[PDB]
Scaffold this motif. Structure first.
Motif, short mmCIF file in Angstrom:
data_model
loop_
_atom_site.label_atom_id
_atom_site.label_comp_id
_atom_site.label_asym_id
_atom_site.label_seq_id
_atom_site.Cartn_x
_atom_site.Cartn_y
_atom_site.Cartn_z
N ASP A 78 54.67 38.54 48.07
CA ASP A 78 55.47 37.44 47.47
C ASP A 78 55.01 37.10 46.04
N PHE A 79 53.73 37.38 45.74
CA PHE A 79 53.16 37.20 44.42
C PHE A 79 53.05 38.48 43.54
N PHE A 80 52.79 39.64 44.17
CA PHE A 80 52.52 40.89 43.46
C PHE A 80 53.75 41.80 43.46
N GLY A 81 54.81 41.37 44.10
CA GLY A 81 56.06 42.09 44.09
C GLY A 81 55.99 43.55 44.44
N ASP A 82 56.73 44.37 43.67
CA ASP A 82 56.67 45.84 43.77
C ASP A 82 55.73 46.44 42.75
N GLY A 83 54.65 45.70 42.39
CA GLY A 83 53.57 46.33 41.72
C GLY A 83 52.91 47.42 42.59
N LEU A 84 51.98 48.15 41.99
CA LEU A 84 51.48 49.38 42.63
C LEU A 84 50.89 49.12 43.97
N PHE A 85 50.13 48.05 44.13
CA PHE A 85 49.42 47.81 45.37
C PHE A 85 50.26 47.39 46.56
N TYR A 250 54.81 42.03 37.44
CA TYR A 250 54.14 42.27 38.73
C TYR A 250 52.92 43.18 38.54
N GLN A 251 52.99 44.15 37.67
CA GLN A 251 51.84 45.04 37.37
C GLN A 251 50.72 44.19 36.73
N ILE A 252 51.03 43.34 35.77
CA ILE A 252 50.01 42.55 35.09
C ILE A 252 49.28 41.70 36.11
N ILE A 253 49.97 40.97 36.97
CA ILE A 253 49.31 40.14 37.95
C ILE A 253 48.49 41.00 38.92
N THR A 254 49.06 42.13 39.35
CA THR A 254 48.38 42.99 40.29
C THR A 254 47.05 43.49 39.70
N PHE A 255 47.09 43.96 38.49
CA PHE A 255 45.89 44.53 37.85
C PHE A 255 44.86 43.47 37.56
N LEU A 256 45.28 42.31 37.12
CA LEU A 256 44.30 41.23 36.81
C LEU A 256 43.49 40.88 38.06
N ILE A 257 44.11 40.88 39.25
CA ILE A 257 43.46 40.53 40.50
C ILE A 257 42.77 41.74 41.11
N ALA A 258 43.49 42.79 41.42
CA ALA A 258 42.93 44.01 41.96
C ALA A 258 41.87 44.58 41.09
N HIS A 260 39.56 43.16 39.44
CA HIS A 260 38.24 42.47 39.39
C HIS A 260 37.63 42.07 40.71
N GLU A 261 38.36 41.67 41.72
CA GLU A 261 37.75 40.97 42.86
C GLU A 261 36.83 41.92 43.66
N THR A 262 37.29 43.10 43.98
CA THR A 262 36.50 44.06 44.72
C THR A 262 35.31 44.55 43.97
N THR A 263 35.40 44.64 42.67
CA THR A 263 34.29 45.13 41.87
C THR A 263 33.19 44.06 41.82
N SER A 264 33.58 42.80 41.75
CA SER A 264 32.61 41.69 41.85
C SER A 264 31.88 41.73 43.15
N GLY A 265 32.60 42.04 44.23
CA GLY A 265 31.96 42.10 45.58
C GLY A 265 30.98 43.28 45.58
N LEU A 266 31.32 44.45 45.06
CA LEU A 266 30.47 45.62 45.07
C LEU A 266 29.20 45.27 44.32
N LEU A 267 29.27 44.71 43.13
CA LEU A 267 28.06 44.44 42.35
C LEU A 267 27.17 43.47 43.12
N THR A 430 38.26 37.08 51.93
CA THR A 430 39.47 36.64 51.23
C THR A 430 40.41 37.87 51.29
N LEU A 431 40.98 38.34 50.18
CA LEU A 431 41.54 39.70 50.11
C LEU A 431 40.37 40.72 50.03
N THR A 432 39.16 40.19 49.79
CA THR A 432 38.01 41.09 49.55
C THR A 432 36.85 40.44 50.38
#
Ligand code: HEM
Length: 451
Positions: A78-85, A250-258, A260-267, A430-432
């Motif tokens: 509903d937020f990321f639309g038909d962006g890649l993810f 939808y790509q811009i919102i998808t990329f801004l979220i996707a 960073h969040e998982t990479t923060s968790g990995l570090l 969360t998502l991550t």
């Protein structure tokens, strides 16, 4: 074979099992109890959770199974639309955006991002150099400042300026609060007691839409050759078409979220495991010192950090930060010689369980041993899947790894770390995934940092 299934709650079937703030961790426990496959029923739906390499290898056959949108991804859509993810593989916009944006993750692209990565990494190091004696670091908080800033700058030439803030950036606050509101809403009645929730929701969607507007307007007002350049101008070689305006948003919102969040968790998890395993820390720190010989790292030197890369892979083994992905049967088929499936049937891959398959990794699966990754051809096909599968695998994998290697290498070069609280792992979902409340003290090695 008849499939195992966890405990039931009358007409609600298994659904109440997910009434927890830690569903993935709950599912892992069920997997430990029931084995490599179990059925999970709710009113109107069924899915089958997979945990072994033997079953997951078959689920990863793209002739038989495709990416599904789980209940979670439908909600995010509903937020990321038909962006890649959040696109289906069969929607025109999936392959079009894939083809247009793939080049933004090439080697030439990563070389181009490196300077801006170093900009943000240098801000993190200077933060920690500037702390007073005996002050601590809030690890996931700082890692999120870093990774949000990095995707904003590298991808979009936008400065979140997260190191100038004690609170989360308003875009992230508004995204989290809009997601929560959307979720609380289903479970509720137009009671004017909820008029305030509706006002807040509109303001949060507006914060998001204003940022997207501004990213695009600032670029049009401005030579960049970054992710946003390709979004706005690139054409799909196959159709010959560029992205449409709605899809770009939808790509811009998808990329801004996707992005960073998982990479923060990995570090965050990497630093956790390093402080809990001092001999591993010493090896990684030694490599950083031996390799990172210049005032700031070069692209080639980051590539040379083999052991740091092994540390990161081992952290992804134990706590892959996007821990589940969903698939559906493209046609009727039998999984593993035993479990018949009908066209459309859903499967979920429990990545943390896959990564604990003793038949692949040996019995010591809970131990943090980067050395598992020292001779990479020794890892069986489909045994290690922190970035997903096939054509629907993570497009950002190289970007995440390059950023995390760079950053962790600099952290290890510049500081000694102490687990001063003997932190007890508490993983927030969360998502991550992230280690909530993880704190350390970092004592400077007093090594100059270049400009
Ligand atoms: C350690 C960090 C990361 C991990 C563990 C991770 C993991 C994943 C996984 C498991 C998927 C597949 C999801 C599915 O099958 O439903 C995925 C997809 C995706 N990731 Fe990542 N990711 C990371 C970093 C990033 C970064 C840095 C970016 C952007 C720069 C990003 C962008 C995406 C996108 C756009 C997709 C969808 C790809 C498609 O289907 O075409 N990810 N990621």
């Amino acid at each position: 074979k008849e499939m195992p299934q966890p405990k039931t709650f009358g007409e609600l079937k298994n659904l109440p099992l997910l009434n927890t703030d830690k569903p993935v961790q709950a599912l892992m426990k069920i997997a430990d109890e029931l084995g490599e496959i179990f059925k999970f029923e709710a009113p109107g739906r069924v899915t089958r959770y997979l945990s072994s390499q033997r079953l997951i290898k078959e689920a990863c056959d793209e002739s038989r199974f495709d990416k599904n949108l789980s209940q979670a991804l439908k909600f995010v859509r509903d937020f990321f639309g038909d962006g890649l993810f959040t696109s289906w593989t069969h929607e025109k916009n999936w392959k079009k955006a894939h083809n247009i944006l793939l080049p933004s993750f090439s080697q030439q692209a990563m070389k181009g991002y490196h300077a801006m990565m170093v900009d943000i990494a240098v801000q993190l190091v200077q933060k920690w150099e500037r702390l007073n004696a005996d002050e601590h670091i809030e690890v996931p908080e700082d890692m999120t400042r870093l990774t949000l800033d990095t995707i904003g700058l590298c991808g979009f030439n936008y400065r979140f300026n997260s190191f100038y803030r004690d609170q989360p950036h308003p875009f992230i606050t508004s995204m989290v609060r809009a997601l929560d509101e959307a979720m609380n809403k289903l479970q509720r009645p137009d009671d004017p007691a909820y008029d305030e929730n509706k006002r807040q929701f509109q303001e949060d969607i507006k914060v998001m839409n204003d940022l997207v507007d501004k990213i695009i307007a600032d670029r049009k007002a401005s030579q960049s050759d970054d992710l946003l350049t390709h979004m706005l101008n690139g054409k799909d070689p196959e159709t010959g078409e560029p992205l449409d305006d709605e899809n770009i948003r939808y790509q811009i919102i998808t990329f801004l979220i996707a992005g960073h969040e998982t990479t923060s968790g990995l570090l965050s998890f990497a630093l956790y495991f390093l402080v809990k395993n001092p001999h591993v820390l010493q090896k990684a720190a030694e490599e950083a010192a031996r390799v990172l010989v210049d005032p700031v790292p070069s692209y080639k030197q980051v590539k040379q950090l083999k052991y740091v890369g092994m540390v990161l892979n081992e952290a992804l083994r134990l706590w892959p930060t996007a821990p589940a992905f969903s698939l559906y049967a493209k046609e009727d088929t039998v999984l593993g010689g035993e479990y018949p499936l009908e066209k459309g049937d859903e499967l979920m891959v429990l990545i943390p369980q896959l990564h604990r398959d003793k038949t692949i990794w040996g019995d010591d699966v809970e131990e943090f041993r980067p050395e598992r990754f020292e001779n990479p051809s020794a890892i069986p096909q489909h045994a290690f899947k922190p970035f997903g599968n096939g054509q629907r695998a993570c497009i950002g994998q190289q970007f995440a790894l390059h950023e995390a290697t760079l950053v962790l290498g600099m952290m290890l070069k510049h500081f000694d770390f102490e687990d001063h609280t003997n932190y007890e792992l508490d993983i927030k979902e969360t998502l991550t995934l992230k280690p909530e409340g993880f704190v350390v003290k970092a004592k400077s090695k007093k090594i100059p940092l270049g400009g």
